[PDB]
Amino acid sequence: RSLIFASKQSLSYLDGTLPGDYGFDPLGLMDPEGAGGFIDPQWLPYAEIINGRFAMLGAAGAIAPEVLGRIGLIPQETAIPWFQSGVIPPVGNYSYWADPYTLFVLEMALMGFAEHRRAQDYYKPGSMGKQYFLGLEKFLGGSGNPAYPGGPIFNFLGFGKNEKELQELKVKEVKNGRLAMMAVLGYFTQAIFTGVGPFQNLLDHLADPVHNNVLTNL
Amino acid sequence: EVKIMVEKDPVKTSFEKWAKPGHFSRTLAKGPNTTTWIWNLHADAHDFDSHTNDLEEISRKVFSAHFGQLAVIFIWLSGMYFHGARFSNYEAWLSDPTHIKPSAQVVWPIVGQKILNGDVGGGFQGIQITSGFFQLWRASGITSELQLYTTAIGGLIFAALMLFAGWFHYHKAAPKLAWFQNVESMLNHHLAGLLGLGSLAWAGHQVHVSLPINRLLDAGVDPKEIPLPHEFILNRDLLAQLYPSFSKGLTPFFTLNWSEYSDFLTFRGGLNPVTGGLWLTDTAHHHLAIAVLFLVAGHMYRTNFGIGHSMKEILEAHKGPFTGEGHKGLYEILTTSWHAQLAINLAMLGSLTIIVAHHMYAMPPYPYLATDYATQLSLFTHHMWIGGFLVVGAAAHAAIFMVRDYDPTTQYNNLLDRVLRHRDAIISHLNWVCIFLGFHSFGLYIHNDTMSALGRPQDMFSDTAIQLQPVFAQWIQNTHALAPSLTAPNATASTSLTWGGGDLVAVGGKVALLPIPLGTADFLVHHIHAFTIHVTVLILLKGVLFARSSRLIPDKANLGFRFPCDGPGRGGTCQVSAWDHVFLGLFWMYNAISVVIFHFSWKMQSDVWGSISDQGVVTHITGGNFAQSSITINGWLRDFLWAQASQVIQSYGSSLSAYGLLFLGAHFVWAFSLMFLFSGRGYWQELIESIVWAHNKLKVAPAIQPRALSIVQGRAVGVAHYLLGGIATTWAFFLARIISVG
Amino acid sequence: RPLWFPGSQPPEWLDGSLPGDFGFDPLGLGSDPELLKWFVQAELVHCRWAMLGAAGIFIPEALTKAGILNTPSWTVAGDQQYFTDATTLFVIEIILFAWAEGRRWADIINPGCVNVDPVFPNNKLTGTDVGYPGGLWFDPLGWGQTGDAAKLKDLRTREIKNGRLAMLAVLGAVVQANYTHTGPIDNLLAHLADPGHNTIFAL
Amino acid sequence: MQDVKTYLSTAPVLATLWFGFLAGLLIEINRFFPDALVLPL
Amino acid sequence: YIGSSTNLIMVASTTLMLFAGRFGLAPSANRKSTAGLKLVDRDSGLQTGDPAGFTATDTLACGAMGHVIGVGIVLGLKATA
Amino acid sequence: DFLVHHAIALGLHTTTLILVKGALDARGSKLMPDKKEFGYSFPCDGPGRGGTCDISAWDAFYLAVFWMLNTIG
Numbered sequence A: 001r002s003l004i005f006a007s008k009q010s011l012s013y014l015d016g017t018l019p020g021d022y023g024f025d026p027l028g029l030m031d032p033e034g035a036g037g038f039i040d041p042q043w044l045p046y047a048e049i050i051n052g053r054f055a056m057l058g059a060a061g062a063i064a065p066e067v068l069g070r071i072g073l074i075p076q077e078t079a080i081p082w083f084q085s086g087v088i089p090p091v092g093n094y095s096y097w098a099d100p101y102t103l104f105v106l107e108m109a110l111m112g113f114a115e116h117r118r119a120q121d122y123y124k125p126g127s128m129g130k131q132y133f134l135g136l137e138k139f140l141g142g143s144g145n146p147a148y149p150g151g152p153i154f155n156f157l158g159f160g161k162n163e164k165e166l167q168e169l170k171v172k173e174v175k176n177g178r179l180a181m182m183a184v185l186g187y188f189t190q191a192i193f194t195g196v197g198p199f200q201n202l203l204d205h206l207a208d209p210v211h212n213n214v215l216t217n218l
Numbered sequence B: 001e002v003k004i005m006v007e008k009d010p011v012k013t014s015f016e017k018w019a020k021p022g023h024f025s026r027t028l029a030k031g032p033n034t035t036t037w038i039w040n041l042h043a044d045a046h047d048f049d050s051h052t053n054d055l056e057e058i059s060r061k062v063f064s065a066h067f068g069q070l071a072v073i074f075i076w077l078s079g080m081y082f083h084g085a086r087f088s089n090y091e092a093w094l095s096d097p098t099h100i101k102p103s104a105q106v107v108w109p110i111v112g113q114k115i116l117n118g119d120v121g122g123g124f125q126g127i128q129i130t131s132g133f134f135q136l137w138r139a140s141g142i143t144s145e146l147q148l149y150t151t152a153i154g155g156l157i158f159a160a161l162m163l164f165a166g167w168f169h170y171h172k173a174a175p176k177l178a179w180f181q182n183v184e185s186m187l188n189h190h191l192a193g194l195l196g197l198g199s200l201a202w203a204g205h206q207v208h209v210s211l212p213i214n215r216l217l218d219a220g221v222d223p224k225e226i227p228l229p230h231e232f233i234l235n236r237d238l239l240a241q242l243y244p245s246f247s248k249g250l251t252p253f254f255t256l257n258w259s260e261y262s263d264f265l266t267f268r269g270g271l272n273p274v275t276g277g278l279w280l281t282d283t284a285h286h287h288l289a290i291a292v293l294f295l296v297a298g299h300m301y302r303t304n305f306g307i308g309h310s311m312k313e314i315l316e317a318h319k320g321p322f323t324g325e326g327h328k329g330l331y332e333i334l335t336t337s338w339h340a341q342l343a344i345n346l347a348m349l350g351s352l353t354i355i356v357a358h359h360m361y362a363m364p365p366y367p368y369l370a371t372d373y374a375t376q377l378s379l380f381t382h383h384m385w386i387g388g389f390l391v392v393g394a395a396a397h398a399a400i401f402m403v404r405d406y407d408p409t410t411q412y413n414n415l416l417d418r419v420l421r422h423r424d425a426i427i428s429h430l431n432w433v434c435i436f437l438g439f440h441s442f443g444l445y446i447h448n449d450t451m452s453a454l455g456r457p458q459d460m461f462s463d464t465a466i467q468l469q470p471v472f473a474q475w476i477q478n479t480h481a482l483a484p485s486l487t488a489p490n491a492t493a494s495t496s497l498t499w500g501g502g503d504l505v506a507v508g509g510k511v512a513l514l515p516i517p518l519g520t521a522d523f524l525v526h527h528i529h530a531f532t533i534h535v536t537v538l539i540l541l542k543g544v545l546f547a548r549s550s551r552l553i554p555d556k557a558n559l560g561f562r563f564p565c566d567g568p569g570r571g572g573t574c575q576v577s578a579w580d581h582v583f584l585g586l587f588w589m590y591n592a593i594s595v596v597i598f599h600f601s602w603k604m605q606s607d608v609w610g611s612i613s614d615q616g617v618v619t620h621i622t623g624g625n626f627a628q629s630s631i632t633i634n635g636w637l638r639d640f641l642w643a644q645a646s647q648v649i650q651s652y653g654s655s656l657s658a659y660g661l662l663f664l665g666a667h668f669v670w671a672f673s674l675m676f677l678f679s680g681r682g683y684w685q686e687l688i689e690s691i692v693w694a695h696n697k698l699k700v701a702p703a704i705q706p707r708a709l710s711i712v713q714g715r716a717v718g719v720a721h722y723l724l725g726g727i728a729t730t731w732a733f734f735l736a737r738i739i740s741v742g
Numbered sequence C: 001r002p003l004w005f006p007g008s009q010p011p012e013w014l015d016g017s018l019p020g021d022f023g024f025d026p027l028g029l030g031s032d033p034e035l036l037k038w039f040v041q042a043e044l045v046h047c048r049w050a051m052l053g054a055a056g057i058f059i060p061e062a063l064t065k066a067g068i069l070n071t072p073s074w075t076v077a078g079d080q081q082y083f084t085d086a087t088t089l090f091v092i093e094i095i096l097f098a099w100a101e102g103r104r105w106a107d108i109i110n111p112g113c114v115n116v117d118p119v120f121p122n123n124k125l126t127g128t129d130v131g132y133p134g135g136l137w138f139d140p141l142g143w144g145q146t147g148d149a150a151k152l153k154d155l156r157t158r159e160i161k162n163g164r165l166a167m168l169a170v171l172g173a174v175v176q177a178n179y180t181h182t183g184p185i186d187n188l189l190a191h192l193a194d195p196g197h198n199t200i201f202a203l
Numbered sequence D: 001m002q003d004v005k006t007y008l009s010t011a012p013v014l015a016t017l018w019f020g021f022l023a024g025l026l027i028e029i030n031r032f033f034p035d036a037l038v039l040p041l
Numbered sequence E: 001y002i003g004s005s006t007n008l009i010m011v012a013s014t015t016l017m018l019f020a021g022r023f024g025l026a027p028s029a030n031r032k033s034t035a036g037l038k039l040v041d042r043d044s045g046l047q048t049g050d051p052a053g054f055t056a057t058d059t060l061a062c063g064a065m066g067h068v069i070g071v072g073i074v075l076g077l078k079a080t081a
Numbered sequence F: 001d002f003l004v005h006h007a008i009a010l011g012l013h014t015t016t017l018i019l020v021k022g023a024l025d026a027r028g029s030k031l032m033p034d035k036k037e038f039g040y041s042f043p044c045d046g047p048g049r050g051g052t053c054d055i056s057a058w059d060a061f062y063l064a065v066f067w068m069l070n071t072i073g
């Protein structure tokens, strides 16, 4: 029953059925009175899920080639920060098997075969596991809530079978999800200010914290 | 209480309402029966208050119409950047702009119009543009045409976004009425989010992109070897070699050592002697200051976070003994009527555009703006015409608020009720000051014409005859020139060169600016300007005040806005309507703004624009004749309307011959206006009856009955051709003369 | 029913009766039943001209690369000199297609009227559907006239889907010639060497 | 197209499409046959 | 920089304005000033753990008036002394 | 001279147009059949029936004074 940063306008719709329902809504964004296209109580918890899971793949992924290079498990050519890895070819470009403009077309082809399927399950649940898709359309049916399908592919260890266990574990997903969005936003501002990768930013601060903070470094 | 109220799918996106043209009005939904249905189809097309009585759907219509307007402006900006990218000599002009004219329009060689592709310089043929886009892109730091093409396709992307948002906020998620009635949040996000963050973002551009590129352009560096704008952001040593204050790296900002930013954030003032345009260290300090000031002003009103102002509480506490219950209900005026807010916003935008015109000839913000005289004359003239049109439209929508949204029950004993209660005093004292100004300016001109005609040059109002020196203006210009020494210390130079601080800036052998003299001629023409502005205020304010009723017609509000008359009774009630006062104020805007731009063109062609030879001698275009010829109407007809029209009429057989063609066709549209203005409907209706008889004789009668245009429509067509023809006449004469002598 | 967008509801005018119907109408231009029959007729001759187009673009240029034939490229094939001038090759073709497509124009408007040979009235086309004329001149093997309708619909579906791949291909050959200035077989072999880099973003 | 072509058949669109074709034709006559003051036929 | 005059003003400009907003000396979200400059209580709806009524809006509002005033005192004293 | 003689013929023809129209629609017309009972130089007949500004024959004379001025100009 922990409640922080809440208002009586915010608790009119945040009744606690959400996983990360801590009452934090000062602006009043999940109000069902003016629910529209993207500012509505059906898309916004599901938007935090997809932004949470891409940031948990993002915050872990932008530091993993830098941590693994200091301990000596990957080559130093790939042991590079995230910004000088072909993402922003101004601050640095690394030569992959393809140039990143061709890799972007390969990205949105595979994202277009993955996020269009994720899109139409939100508008109508279970309507995608009917048409033939490579003999694997039966597993891609999903639940009523489109943030958690829980099929044979997205729950392939079956972890969280109990309803009380799965609901409490959904709280740990969004709280690790929300920390990862502030990490990637923290990764973004440190890449512009410090100009060096985030694992070097942790190692610089762990040696001299009073001389390598945000105030000293730009 | 401020939060998002929208609702989902109000109207289905269908083409079945496209097929029926008059769907918005109940009278036009029955289909056509006369040819006046077509004109009321266009007249009531945008009039959303006449369609429905529900302000919610009206506000949704206005919001999506704003998005469609934004899409049209982004399509226009996409076109002007694509014309810079493909059909211009912007790189050739950017190599050296003192000899190559700005041109961004290529015509097709089809019917002899390929002579209009003139020798503008740089190995390029095209129409010499006067819109100032080249100097604007030089001030933006644009070096290549690939950046212009990228800005064009980005503007096309934003135009598609505005079209998508206009469809979205009418057919998918349209806001409700209380969303638009959150005016405190709208002002908080327009002051801070739009004008504050916009000024802050353009300040960041003018710190990183405009400033180092324009510093390298002052050093004579070729733009093909100037480093690209992101290289200053990436290689900050390259940015630090032009400004050493960048070597500290954002630590003086958060430690309040802002004076260490004195290398690139200055309060210099004046013009760059290399280019003739304002400094971008001053334009970047200007934008950073108006951003740290609009973002402060955007945290003023009360939305839903407790702190702030309810502006109804601001208004209802503003009440005085000369008014009593004033300012009360004006919040209910300005949140339940779109026309009242449109009147205030149009008055501020038109007056602001006039501010823009004066603050651009006088303080030219763009490099090589002042020395390209065609750009200066066209920018001043364009912004004066836009500003005059918007202030006449301000009075128009003020009058529409009176005839269709003014509720007298909610407005008792406030400011508006008392202004209506003494409107005879306002209009009569305005009438007196207009007649007094008309004699004491134009009869002074007639007196000068008479004594110059009668061989009495000493009996005139000259600088050599009876002097009428503007001692207040001549003192405020000395106060603005002798300011840096004592009243404004921290300034390196003065605000403008036209004040009297010397600094004869010569850019390319042509005068950017110098001290502007003010004499008897300037006094006379400024009293003409005050007179014409006052008379335009007189017709327009009379239409606002007598929109409800009059001593003549006490039930004028029931007749509406676009009604012609009551009839031939009470002696004749022709043009009693508030619309007809907007119609006459359009003519008085023509008169006012046309004399303003005529005074501008002659005043700076005689006292500012020219050339500087060796040993500091300044030869103007029409040397020194404003002080002696602009005090008589014969000088205005002779040394301005005849001497300077000696390049619009003999431009035939050259690249400026389209200005001669549109000069003559503009005379045609003006004399065509006099057909609609002087005539009336019933004559044309019976002439059309004779033509309909000739059609009945040969069985070519249309079922849509041919009708004469309505009296409101005939006046609208006449004033549209009058403004179009006269404004196009001045456009053609200006853009032929100052291109020819520039 | 296979559909192009498996979550979307199929349109009312596309009921699946047409060959190659996958419900793809986001702009809804085939909403009118009279205009839908014109557009199906427009898509049939578009499909068969592009498959005839793709056999004159990608087949002889593959033989040009393999050295089987010395034919020129498809972009510069009209520039070559023949025994008839290319200006007056058009009006021979326009006259010959005023009888080929003008008599096809009557079949779309009035079905079952131009199925009889005018010179010899005994000769006639064994066709009952608009756009599939049959007869000896157009179906000499008789595969398009079958008693069963499920196999006949799938064979017409096989014709449409083979067509619309070529309408992507001939349009693909046009933009490849405008961008790369190279024959599309040579664009394929450049892409078959290094597919990571030799793409549209190779510039 | 029961109503889209009805909008396309309206008076301003059909005037734009005809005069776009009409001025499109008369410009293209004035390219291949320019400066035509006397009809030779 | 810690003992410098820029740090001591900007701390004390922020601390005294937060002291004024908490101890009922400044306008805040939960208490309004009328035309007579009299502090009258209101319910803004914002709920925090403060018994006085200090919320997350006021610590951003009084921090800003700790900063808008505090910048002007620092640069006012920089040009003067 | 040819072109300005057609300008002259335009001027005489349009002045004759307005004046013959005023003289022959003097008694009445399809817009207003009782123009004779309103006199010669009456102002209008009101905003009704579309609008009847300059309906009188004096107003056709009035509009053709501009056309004689343009013609003789």
Ligand code: CLA
Residues within 6 Å of the ligand: B063, B066, B067, B070, B161, B179, B180, B182, B183, B185, B186, B189, B190, B192, B193, B194
């Ligand atoms: C901080 C947020 C913010 C900002 C930046 C603006 C900005 C704007 N508003 Mg908006 N508005 C807001 C919030 C905001 N609004 C709030 C809270 C209210 C509700 C009470 C309104 C309700 C309101 C209405 C009803 C209308 C506007 C209109 C306008 C436009 C001004 C007209 C123009 O030509 O300007 C210059 C235009 C531009 C510079 C174009 C910019 C367009 C881009 C895509 C940004 C706009 C999106 C969004 C507002 C902010 C996203 C920021 C993004 C860049 C990260 C402009 C787009 C007017 C308009 O034109 O309607 C469309 C209009 O009358 N506003």
Ligand code: CLA
Residues within 6 Å of the ligand: B042, B043, B044, B045, B046, B047, B048, B342, B346, B389, B390, B392, B393, B394, B396, B397, B400, B561, B562, B579, B582, B583, B586, B720, B724
């Ligand atoms: C911010 C700008 C703004 C706003 C929102 C509006 C909004 C409106 N105006 Mg307007 N108004 C303004 C400023 C603006 N105006 C200005 C600039 C003027 C001075 C001219 C006025 C004077 C005014 C009057 C006099 C009246 C309105 C009215 C109207 C309403 C509907 C008009 C309609 O259906 O369009 C109709 C659109 C046309 C007929 C298009 C014609 C465009 C002009 C007149 C001619 C073409 C000019 C063009 C540049 C020349 C090209 C020539 C070439 C094609 C050969 C609507 C409320 C009317 C109303 O009833 O209000 C409720 C009306 O009576 N307006």
Ligand SMILES: CC1=C[C@H](O)CC(C)(C)[C@H]1/C=C/C(C)=C/C=C/C(C)=C/C=C/C=C(C)/C=C/C=C(C)/C=C/C1=C(C)C[C@H](O)CC1(C)C
Residues within 6 Å of the ligand: C024, C025, C026, C027, C028, C029, C030, C045, C046, C047, C049, C050, C052, C053, C054, C055, C056, C057, C073, C074, C075, C077, C078, C166, C167, C168, C170, C171
């Ligand atoms: C349906 C839909 C739905 C809704 O409506 C919406 C939308 C979107 C609109 C849609 C879609 C559309 C599309 C996609 C279109 C496209 C098309 C195409 C591309 C075609 C082509 C098509 C194509 C074609 C025919 C082609 C043809 C070809 C040809 C003849 C060729 C020829 C040739 C050859 C042999 C070779 C030589 O050496 C040369 C030549 C002579 C050259």
Ligand SMILES: CC1=C(/C=C/C(C)=C/C=C/C(C)=C/C=C/C=C(C)/C=C/C=C(C)/C=C/C2=C(C)CCCC2(C)C)C(C)(C)CCC1
Residues within 6 Å of the ligand: B292, E014, E059, E060, E061, E062, E063, E064, E067, E068, E071
């Ligand atoms: C929990 C608690 C506590 C604590 C509290 C505190 C300590 C608080 C803090 C707070 C704070 C301490 C806050 C601050 C804030 C700040 C802010 C809010 C800021 C803002 C800013 C702005 C507004 C901007 C700026 C600027 C200016 C002003 C000028 C120009 C430049 C710039 C833009 C930068 C105590 C111990 C009592 C007790 C127990 C509990």
Ligand SMILES: CC1=C(C/C=C(\C)CCC[C@H](C)CCC[C@H](C)CCCC(C)C)C(=O)c2ccccc2C1=O
Residues within 6 Å of the ligand: B675, B676, B677, B679, B680, B681, B684, B685, B707, B708, B709, B710, B711, B713, B714, B715
């Ligand atoms: C001329 C005139 C008319 C008559 C004006 C008319 C009938 C408008 C004519 C518009 C066009 C020229 C006719 C409609 C054109 C159609 C679109 C058909 C196209 C034909 C060609 C233009 C291609 C008035 O009704 C009137 C009313 C009040 C005061 C003055 C006047 C006035 O001066």
Ligand code: SF4
Residues within 6 Å of the ligand: B564, B565, B566, B567, B568, B569, B572, B573, B574, B575, B680, B711, F043, F044, F045, F046, F047, F051, F052, F053, F054
């Ligand atoms: S002429 Fe027309 S506007 Fe004037 S009074 Fe008569 S009907 Fe009314």
